Amino acid sequence: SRVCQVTGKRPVTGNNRSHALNATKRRFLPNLHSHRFWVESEKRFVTLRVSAKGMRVIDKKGIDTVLAELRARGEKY
Template sequence: MSKICQVTGKRPVTGNNVSHANNKTRRRFVPNLHYKRFWVASENHFVRLRVSAKGIRIIDKKGIEAVLADLSSAGLKL
């Protein structure tokens, strides 16, 4: 499974580790992803999403039903 947040679309990006001596080595910055179950009261069941910490905050702010409506209009099948 790819490391992409289903709510925000965050994905790994590349960059450099930079030492004190300014030596640079390539690395990946990966998002803080978690599998989390959200209760959808209108449909009376849980929905399992792979979301970043920012995605969880967005769901807390807007509500799971509004976020699911946005995802379904974007074409993501849940």
């Protein structure tokens, strides 16, 4: 499913509102990308399905902390 493994962002339902204020249901999808992160603690490439915001979170925190959170949450990566 379209879920960011770092942040948990899912598709979220909302409205397309016309100029006549016609409300038709729609989905906002996240900006998911499958990325191979070079983990140094294991000398490996770990593939994760991550949003761009999650990638910024990885850049800030460090991949080690993010993976620690993921494995504390479960999330077989």
